[PDB]
């Protein structure tokens, strides 16, 4: 196990940390959903635009991908990097109904067969390294348990934590984020950097997000 990738991690998830009622994330806070996809996609400077010479790359496990909505199937101006035992880049782009956007999607497809260790080992390689800038874990469940777990938390870097304030009482899927400044099981302290006041959904979907950065030791 030498060096690795460092990443960070996205999450949208209510008081009790919950993230999704099995298949379909719960929440489409929009103002939520429009910084995942700056946040995940946006590179670092002025004016500067992903292409598929420099773009970031969003690791997610398999699971994750099937709750993707078809639409989303593949995040688009990103590397999607799946982490499935079983299947494919054959199986992954089945996922993608429409067969034309279907062919154009394995550009920027990649199945990992491994878990997150083995990708962020991937994702250390000199292509990985310069055409790639950033790392994101973007879910599901199992994923963000060993992003916080040795030895992938040695190289997690930030957490950007989304807080829906009407927490959802219908999630089946969570995220295990010892509160905020706990000396974990593990033995990490999740530090609050920073977090945005509170605001509220303009939609009908008016409930009320905050943008929580957390970080290690
Ligand atoms: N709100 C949010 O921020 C987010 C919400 N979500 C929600 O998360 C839920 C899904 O969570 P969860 O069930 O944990 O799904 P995961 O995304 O954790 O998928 C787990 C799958 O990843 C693969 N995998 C995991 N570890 C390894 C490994 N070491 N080696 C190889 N393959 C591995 C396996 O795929 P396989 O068995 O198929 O090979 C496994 O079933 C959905 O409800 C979704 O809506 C997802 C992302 C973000
Ligand atoms: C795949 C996927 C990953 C996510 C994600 C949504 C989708 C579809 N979210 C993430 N973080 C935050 N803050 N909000 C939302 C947009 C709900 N991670």
């Given at each position: 196990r030498p060096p690795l990738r460092p990443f960070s991690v996205v999450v949208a998830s209510d008081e009790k940390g919950g993230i999704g009622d099995?298949?379909?994330?719960?929440?489409?806070?929009p103002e939520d959903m429009q910084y995942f996809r700056r946040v995940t996609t946006n590179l670092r400077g002025k004016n500067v635009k992903p292409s598929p010479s420099k773009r970031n790359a969003v690791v997610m496990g398999r699971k994750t991908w099937d709750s993707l909505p078809p639409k989303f199937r593949?995040?688009?101006?990103r590397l999607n990097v799946v982490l499935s035992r079983s299947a494919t880049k054959e199986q992954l782009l089945?996922?993608?109904?429409?067969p034309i956007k279907r062919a154009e999607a394995a550009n920027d497809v990649v199945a990992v067969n491994g878990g997150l260790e083995d990708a962020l080992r991937m994702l250390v390689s000199k292509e990985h390294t310069s055409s790639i800038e950033t790392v994101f874990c973007i879910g599901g469940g199992t994923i963000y348990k060993q992003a916080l777990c040795a030895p992938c938390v040695?190289?997690?870097?930030a957490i950007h934590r989304t807080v829906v304030?009407?927490?959802?009482?219908?999630?089946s899927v969570f995220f295990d984020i010892p509160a905020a400044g706990t000396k974990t099981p593990e033995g990490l302290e999740l530090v609050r950097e920073s977090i945005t006041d509170e605001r509220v959904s303009?939609?009908?979907?008016g409930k009320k997000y905050q943008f929580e950065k957390l970080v290690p030791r």
């Open positions: 099995g298949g379909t994330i719960p929440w489409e806070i593949p995040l688009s101006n089945a996922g993608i109904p429409d040695n190289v997690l870097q304030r009407p927490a959802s009482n219908s999630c303009t939609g009908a979907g």
